[PDB]
């Protein structure tokens, strides 16, 4: 059935983490909500966005282009709910700050706040990829902001191992 999450480490009651490829995990879990690491015009190139879109055979991009034509661009820190196509029931497209490009890291909390409208989500860490936020900081903001249940997928083994070990050094 849907939301078949298993094999995660519970960091807090709210936040779970796994070393996984989010696309493969979405196919296995059938989440009601997968989070995309989006940008304001929903141009899904590269990173998680490109990978999710490719796995939908570009259906996500076609739908996103229609969303933009009928709603305009998002703002940094904002989100929209669109179809999850074959990957999920819905995709929550969330725009975290691109700090390598001179967007304010302080907007990361507002980006995570979008998760609080959904009871269960499969998600990447926000503002990682080529966006430039320190992943441990992104995880901290996630833990301190999200109040539903988020299942985080971290691709690289070394980063996963570090996030766990570094997170466990912080005050509980």
UniProtKB/Swiss-Prot annotation:
It is found in: Host endoplasmic reticulum membrane. Changing residue 32 to A: In strain: Mu/B.1.621. It catalyses: Thiol-dependent hydrolysis of ester, thioester, amide, peptide and isopeptide bonds formed by the C-terminal Gly of ubiquitin (a 76-residue protein attached to proteins as an intracellular targeting signal). Residues 2-171 form the Macro domain. It is a multi-pass membrane protein. Inhibited in vitro by GRL-0617. It comes from the Viruses. Responsible for the cleavages located at the N-terminus of the replicase polyprotein. Participates together with nsp4 in the assembly of virally-induced cytoplasmic double-membrane vesicles necessary for viral replication. Antagonizes innate immune induction of type I interferon by blocking the phosphorylation, dimerization and subsequent nuclear translocation of host IRF3. Also prevents host NF-kappa-B signaling. In addition, PL-PRO possesses a deubiquitinating/deISGylating activity and processes both 'Lys-48'- and 'Lys-63'-linked polyubiquitin chains from cellular substrates. May form homohexamers. Interacts with N protein. This is Papain-like protease nsp3. It comes from Severe acute respiratory syndrome coronavirus 2. The lineage of its organism: Viruses, Riboviria, Orthornavirae, Pisuviricota, Pisoniviricetes. The chain holds residues 1025 to 1195 of 7096 of the full protein.
